[PDB]
Design a protein around this ligand. Structure first.
Ligand code: NI
Length: 276
């Protein structure tokens, strides 16, 4: 069992680091190209993650009261958006300079964030099937990345509370008849891959940010703790990939809109209801 993120996937920062130096950026990119997953430690201040964790746990009762609680694949992996109230929208989270340095270098200067969502993994949750969150664009074709998932754990993720299983290097795999309509990986391909490059799972401390290819094979797993495990999730896409805009209150337009760290946003006059 791993006690920490593996050194080969990890770059250590502080919240004062606003850019990676050239050698660190090169390493970040080499990790993403080879392994499809990069763990950045020490990115976000406690003040921010505390507030986001508290807001998501406070919203959970409303989410659980809905008629059909929306889940990712199997019981206990609840889809839950974080609030888009002005007081909980932070430049260092939505427009993190290190994250965008990386996504600009991989996806281009006009890459844009188009997801502001989350995954609440409840106590007693089930095992998800191995899947990709975003598909390859044509079957049987090798092509470069068009999207990067930016995952923000809001508590310490442990082997006990449902730290995600990742399949390193799987982001480039796209043989024929590999994926079903839900993005789940066909069992024959899973087992062939396992023999060559087995999956890994490891603790990730709150304050970290995980950047990964949207095509990376992974699965959520059971949370065997007594506490819900919140993840905040964003996804950067090439400018040409069609996505609906993120609904944001126009009280953040001044700093969101016109930044060179792009967001595909629609700005609204009221407060936005993130939950319904
Ligand atoms: Ni997933």
């Amino acid at each position: 069992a791993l006690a920490a993120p593996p050194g080969e996937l990890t770059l250590a920062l502080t919240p004062d680091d606003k850019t990676l130096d050239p050698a660190s950026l090169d390493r970040a990119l080499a990790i993403l190209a080879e392994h499809g997953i990069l763990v950045l430690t020490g990115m976000l201040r406690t003040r921010l993650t505390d507030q986001l964790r508290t807001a998501m746990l406070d919203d959970l009762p409303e989410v659980l009261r809905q008629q059909d609680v929306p889940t990712n694949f199997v019981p206990g992996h609840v889809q839950q958006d974080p609030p888009v109230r002005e007081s909980l929208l932070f430049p260092d989270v939505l427009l993190n300079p290190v994250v965008y340095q990386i996504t600009h270098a991989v996806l281009g200067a006009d890459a844009r964030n188009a997801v502001y969502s989350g995954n609440m993994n409840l106590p007693g949750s089930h095992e998800q099937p191995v899947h990709l969150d975003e598909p390859h664009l044509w079957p049987g074709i090798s092509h470069p990345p068009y999207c990067l998932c930016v995952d923000v754990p809001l508590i310490d993720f442990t082997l006990e509370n449902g730290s995600t299983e990742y399949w390193p290097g799987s982001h480039v795999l796209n043989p024929d008849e590999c994926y079903d309509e839900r993005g789940c990986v066909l069992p024959a391909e899973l087992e062939r891959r396992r023999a060559v490059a087995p999956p890994v799972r490891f603790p990730i401390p709150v304050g970290s940010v995980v950047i990964r290819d949207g095509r990376l094979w992974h699965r959520g797993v059971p949370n065997l703790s007594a506490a819900p495990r919140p993840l905040l999730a964003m996804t950067h896409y090439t400018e040409w990939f069609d996505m609906p805009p993120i609904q944001l209150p126009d009280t953040v337009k001044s700093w969101v809109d016109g930044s060179d760290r792009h967001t595909h946003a629609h700005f609204v006059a009221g407060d936005v209801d993130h939950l319904t």
